[PDB]
Amino acid sequence: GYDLSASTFSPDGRVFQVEYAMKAVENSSTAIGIRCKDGVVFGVEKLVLSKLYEEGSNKRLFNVDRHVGMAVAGLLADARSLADIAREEASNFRSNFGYNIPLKHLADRVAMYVHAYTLYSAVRPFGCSFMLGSYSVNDGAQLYMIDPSGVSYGYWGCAIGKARQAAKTEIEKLQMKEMTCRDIVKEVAKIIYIVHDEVKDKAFELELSWVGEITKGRHEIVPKDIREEAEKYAKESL
Amino acid sequence: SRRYDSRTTIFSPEGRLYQVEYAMEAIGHAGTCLGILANDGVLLAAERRNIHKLLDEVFFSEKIYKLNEDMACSVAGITSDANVLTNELRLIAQRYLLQYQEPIPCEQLVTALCDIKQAYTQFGGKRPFGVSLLYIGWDKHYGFQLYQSDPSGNYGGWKATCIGNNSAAAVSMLKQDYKEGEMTLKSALALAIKVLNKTMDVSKLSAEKVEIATLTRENGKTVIRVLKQKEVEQLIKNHEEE
Amino acid sequence: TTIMAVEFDGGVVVGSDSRVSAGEAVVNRAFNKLSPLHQHIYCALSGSAADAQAMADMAAYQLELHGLELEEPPLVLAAANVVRNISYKYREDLSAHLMIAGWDRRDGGQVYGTMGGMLTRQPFAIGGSGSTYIYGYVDAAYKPGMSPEECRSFTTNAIALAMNRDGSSGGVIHLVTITAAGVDYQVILGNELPKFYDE
Amino acid sequence: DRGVNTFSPEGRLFQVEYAIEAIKLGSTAIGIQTSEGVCLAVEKRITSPLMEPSSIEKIVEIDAHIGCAMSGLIADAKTLIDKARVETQNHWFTYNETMTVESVTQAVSNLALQFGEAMSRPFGVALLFGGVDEKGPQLFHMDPSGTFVQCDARAIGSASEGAQSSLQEVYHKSMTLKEAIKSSLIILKQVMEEKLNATNIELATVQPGQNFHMFTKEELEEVIK
Amino acid sequence: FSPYAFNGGTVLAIAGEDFSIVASDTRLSEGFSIHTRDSPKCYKLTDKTVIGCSGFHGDCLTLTKIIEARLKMYKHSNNKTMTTGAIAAMLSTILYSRRFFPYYVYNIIGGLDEEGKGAVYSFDPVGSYQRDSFKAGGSASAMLQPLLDNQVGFKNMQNVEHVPLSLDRAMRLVKDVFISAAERDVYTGDALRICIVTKEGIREETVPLRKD
Amino acid sequence: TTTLAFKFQHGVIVAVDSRATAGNYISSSRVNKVIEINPSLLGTMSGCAADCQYWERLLAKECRLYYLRNGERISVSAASKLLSNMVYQYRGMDLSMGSMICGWDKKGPGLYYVDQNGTRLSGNMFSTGSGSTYAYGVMDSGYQPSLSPEEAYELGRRAITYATHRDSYSGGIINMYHMKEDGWVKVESTDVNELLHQYQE
Amino acid sequence: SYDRAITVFSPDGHLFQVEYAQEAVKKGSTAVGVRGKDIVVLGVEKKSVAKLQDERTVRKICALDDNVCMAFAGLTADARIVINRARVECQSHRLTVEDPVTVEYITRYIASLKQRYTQSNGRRPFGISALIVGFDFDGTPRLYQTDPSGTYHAWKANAIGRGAKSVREFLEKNYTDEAIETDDLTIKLVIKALLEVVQSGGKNIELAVMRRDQPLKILNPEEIEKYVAEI
Amino acid sequence: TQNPMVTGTSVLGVKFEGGVVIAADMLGSYGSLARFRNISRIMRVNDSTMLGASGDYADFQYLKQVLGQMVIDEELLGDGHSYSPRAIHSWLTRAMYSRRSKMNPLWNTMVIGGYADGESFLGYVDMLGVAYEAPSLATGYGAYLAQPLLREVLEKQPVLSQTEARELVERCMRVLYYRDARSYNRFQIATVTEKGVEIEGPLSAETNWEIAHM
Amino acid sequence: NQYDNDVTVWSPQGRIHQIEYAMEAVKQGSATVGLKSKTHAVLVALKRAQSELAAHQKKILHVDNHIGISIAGLTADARLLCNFMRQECLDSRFVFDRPLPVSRLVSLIGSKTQIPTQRYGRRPYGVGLLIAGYDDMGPHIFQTCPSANYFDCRAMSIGARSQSARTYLERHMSGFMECNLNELVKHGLRALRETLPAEQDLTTKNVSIGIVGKDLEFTIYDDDDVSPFLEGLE
Ligand SMILES: *[B]([O])([O])[C]([C][C]([C])[C])[N]C(=O)C1=[C]N([C]2[C][C][C][C][C]2)N=N1
């Protein structure tokens, strides 16, 4: 057994425990992030597993700082822990240096924290993936994605979850570079409706959040009325 | 973590401590160590394993270590493990002297080291020390004494005893040749040679293959010395004529 | 000790005296109290020489690492915050006021006073034992919109007036001008200092 | 090999389930709570004729108003018994009053699942707490899982299944202490391998106004007839 | 720097056959100035227990919060409300835990005991306490206590019937001693707050005192 | 404060006054300065009221635990040693407690003096408190080991009364106890003013 | 720090390591205790009777204090540790209670320590069983027996070690009041019991008697020989 | 903090119909020297709470940093719960008391103003942990100079309008400038109502020196 | 097989068997139902009886004036979590002088119960909970699990045969908001009754109630106090 611990390399140079944690992310629902000219829009296909649950239960969109949003996929409990780690990192940076933590630096810190759970037998790798979106006058729009192994990259468009491949194809058709947040929100809604499965995983709720010039650098949930148009437009599209 | 733990300090199904028994196996193949108590002193005779021609000689001895002013010891088993215990013995003796301003009684020193050995066999998860020791010393309570302790933490006082290679056969010879209360250092040295000649399997005994130390009282003071090649060579000659 | 820093459109001018004293004896008459924390960020030291030197080194180290992690030149406010943090945390043990001045691409020339753990941004700052004698002088002479040359002249005059009156100040005047183009050092020797009413 | 805090496929902690198995090898203890008080009877289960019956203590005093009967691994019970005694005395010192039976049982129960790799395993014992407080006579039962509950009548130990049946067929809300004491001894004798005399069993009661009282040899003989 | 401040204030408690009264003035002070004229010094603990505190207001606020939490913790682990006497026993140990850096508070507890009779307990700052029939604490305590000894305890009187104290008489006496204390003690004034504890619950009454 | 105790042919007498003060102000005249640990054990208090009340109550807890663990009832000698070891850990920290531990165990009537410094002494008679020197004078002048119970009660009452007359810190009422083989009995609770007026006449 | 749980519950409700510790006790030297009128008798099989051995260095019977002695069976190194822990306990009890410990008090402490090693992380249970005797403050004779699990019981007569059952089975039928009437009669019961398992009973048996206010009075070769002679 | 370096003087506060108003000058004093003449001693906590502080400026900056983060942390959750003025006042009280208990006090006297659920809040918290509420407040030298005037107006008219409260505060600022040696004629006025927290400044009081000629 | 002994071991299908085994503990416990209206939050638990002579094991616990909880699974774990919740609530009142918002308390339970699912040698809490509470945002019903996940629900049921209780709640949930306290509790008892086998019924010996609302502190009704709620139920 070469795949029982994170501190054991297999004969062909692989850490099977880290790869098993990635399977958990692939079982989760899709979440996409799109970076445009004015900011970043987040969209999650939140599956409603029961009618007894209230609307807004088990949200997958977090606020880790005033200007930073986080979209997650995988084990919700693992993801909530990572969100707390990120919040503390942002708060710590403000205390030590006196200003808003740059997104890239925040993504680096969290990724290394994630990377620390992939070296020992004493702990197990995190079972989730997440995206970090942000916007500031100085830095502009930023979007990063971190997976269970701890690798983090910057993206123009990203997707995580079960239909990550199908969502990626949809994202490549758009020209987000010259687009603005307002028109991108509808597109994000559209893509999630297209990749959503009907036969399996019946009934889902669309979660939307954004950060950019339109929200004055503050990450927040997309206003209900703006999400209405997007939901309407996405329904007609497909 | 649990998958790799060798569990060194647990009871086996028949109430045995495997690591302790396995360490005893290692001591049984090591160099022969014999101790004999006489009326005017004690002696230590140990077979040398380091006999290569390119080896150099610059220490006090090889298997005989002075512990304090009135005590010496010999070891059998893992050499590097013996270095750790011998250093610990020296510290125990010095700590007793710092506290009471008197040399530590022989038996008290052995008991303190046995406590450390017992601790390894009960908790901690570490492998035990693979060493068996022979102690010779003089104190104001019991005079000349001889002790032997092993990896389990057990020890005992003896008039003559042997540890290491062919110790069972050496002990047999000692039973039929040792005269209780009628032995002298000169007569003990001859017996040592006799016993050493039998247990060892290399025909000619040889002075280079052995190391002998004696402990005596001279002018109100303990004297511990390792016999030189000449004295040892002469002793071997005596056996030939004997 | 007398230190002073002035903000101008496009950079800062920072200067100080060169006297280190132990009671009535001058232990070092040509000490450099202007210390660089980074390429475009400087700090003026006043108070205990040991405390200030230790703080400056600790900060330079923290800022260097910070700059390599963020892949960009550190902001002047970040340098002031790092100094403020150390100064506030150890206020009971440290007896040194590290005045911060520098240039960055976001806010330009900035001067920060961080004495005792309190951070304040000012158009011009003065510190040290000798600064008490020039408060009146700087309040009446300072004018907004001064050029770097005028700022250099303004700083030299104020320091010279303090050196003449304050026993703990004297020697030469160290001067550094920081802008986007870089750091310019300058030393005004004893025989080249501004002269005022002396007798 | 698994760790001590491993869950089984059916949702149970292996070690806790094995500890409950140990309770089944222990001597039978019976507890009955009535309106006039609570009585505790435990089979001494003396192994040999050379063994002194007085040295066996299955019923102990926690405080003046609280008694305790144990079953299972007796050596593990001592740790809990001392803890309980300390709790009530601490409570007396702090609040100048007596601790209730429920509170004492709760405090002792909180030490059941505190083990991992500090206890290295759960306690292999079951306890019966009987006493009197403001709510009158009270009988509580605690097992190795940390679960404790108030009971009217309860049997623990090797023959607990048989004892329980008898108990529930002969117990009513109006029965007096005398009936309980007699009834509990009747059932003890029926499930005891050896003959029930006055030296091979233990009995104690606690009533309102009276302290924890361990029946003597003479008092048992009288009742045994 | 001094970790204490004298904030003034007087507290009184009186136990009757089936009632207890806890009263206090409402002036909070520091030095020669008045911080506020509306700071009562008596807090409700349960439906039959009130505590009156006086001394350093910083410790008075913290101790009341600590007692309030201990009552909830006791209820959760004992399944009942703490009685007046268990609260008194517990307060003693809390004050003695800061025996080397004491709470500078004079406490007086007033309530009903388990037999429904009035109970009063008085404390010194480090925890020593006892049950009394009546007690004054705080700034004007040495002015009030001698008068209560004579008019409630009947000390130094001959040919006097020792009748039981009624609520009505006890109320008038409480108002009178505080009126006398506001004339002489500079820290006592503004208003008088009286809490009456009986089996029907706690009723409050407020009476004005001199403002100078 | 004045407390006293003495052994005689019929057991131990223990008597105290009941005054507590803060400076010159008399904070109480009804303090109970005798703690009843168990039915055969008593503790007297002198010094700081909170220290005495707290450490003697802690001894009572330890005495009770000892009885539950051993099933035997602690002896007077072991109770006093337990108290002396308890307060010895805080030596030098300004604790103020002067106690007498009195009882009847297997070795007969026991009387020990224990104080905050760690002093522990067994004896036939002791007095503690600010009025203790006055009590010693009267107690030693009229003490005989063959006193009858009534005579011992009278000596105890006179020694406390005269101490309260001379010592400003003592007064109130006298609480007296009688330690016997079967346990202690509370003898009486008399106001010292009634006593002194009856001695004055 | 090694914190692995060594003693855990088995499926049948048994503690494997504790049962294995009991196996070790079975291989130990036979020890026999018998209660008497005003003296307690302890008999241990000397076994190792080598002619090159310093007999005094390896005594099984030891003193815990001035009033309590004890014999053990099983791992001799484990025994030495427990004996020394009890010695410290006796000293502590004399400095906090101002009185010597009773027989049951030291038995309780020893039993409690054994129980602690069956429920602690990183350690195995002690592999020994002990027989504790002596007299209390008044003057009554006691005989207790503790085992590896931490349970202890008072006995009239008991045996431990190898072939303990055989000596226990024979002890029931031979223990009476006439048998333990006189001091020299308490030495007769023990020896016979030991003789049922001890090879060449005679010089292979150590002896010790604890009297009233009298120290550990070990018997001697000839002293024991007298009884052996007559028998 | 046993030795405060740069300190601020009095802080005023008074309740009015539908809000609270607080005032403080912009001076940072170093002993008797008026070292920093342009520092704000009033901070907006959230939409319903404001904070004024006297005493050690570095301690106030540290409290402002900690309080500011707490509010940000709470806002991240977006759960519909926010800190009320009362809750902040309580938190500050515990913070000060804790520091005082470790013999390392935060050398500040604070005034907390707030408006929530149609109720105006005014709290005081000193460095020893002493806390309370009142219709009007004045720290430091204001307790002796401003409070008397404030209380006098509230003894005749308990409920003030926003305009009345504002004028009353300005009258107090002038008196403070005339009689407090550590004061400066440059101050800020913060107001909290249903619309949020507003901070006006810098302001100056009109001074009369007619008596000098007399 | 080799993937179901430790909580730190991910299986090849991307699951953690130990956490799934801990969920089994909740499923075997007696059912408990939690529902709410626009003004109230109700907790209804089926008290199980180990014996015929023993008392019914408590299921509903007071945590604070505005918060109540119901437990299903390991009792030891429930007490540990309840103690933690009580302490968090006490801290909130001591520091901010106000009740801790229910949602924030549930978040704290989530992070605390997640820690042991990632550390070697630790085990997940084997208990599920139903949290009833009332604060500024109204009445709430939360559900926690052994995998540290939590849900905000309109109504919920956990424990043995709670699927049928959930089935019942699903069809009657539409008229829960407008429902008044008395009828809201009935809907709760009816759903709880579904989990019982045909023969057995809801009595005053096996049904405990917990209620909290707009103008009511969390109160637990047991034995004779639950009579009123039962009487009149078809
Ligand atoms: B200045 O006077 O403030 C000056 C500024 C320093 C260099 C930052 N300080 C000092 O003069 C000074 C002198 N010393 C020590 C005195 C004792 C001998 C070593 C130097 N510390 N600060």
Ligand SMILES: *[B]([O])([O])[C]([C][C]([C])[C])[N]C(=O)C1=[C]N([C]2[C][C][C][C][C]2)N=N1
């Ligand atoms: B006695 O005077 O010793 C008496 C004995 C006590 C009541 C058991 N002591 C006191 O009167 C007394 C005085 N104090 C403090 C002294 C310092 C000021 C506060 C009171 N504590 N007990």
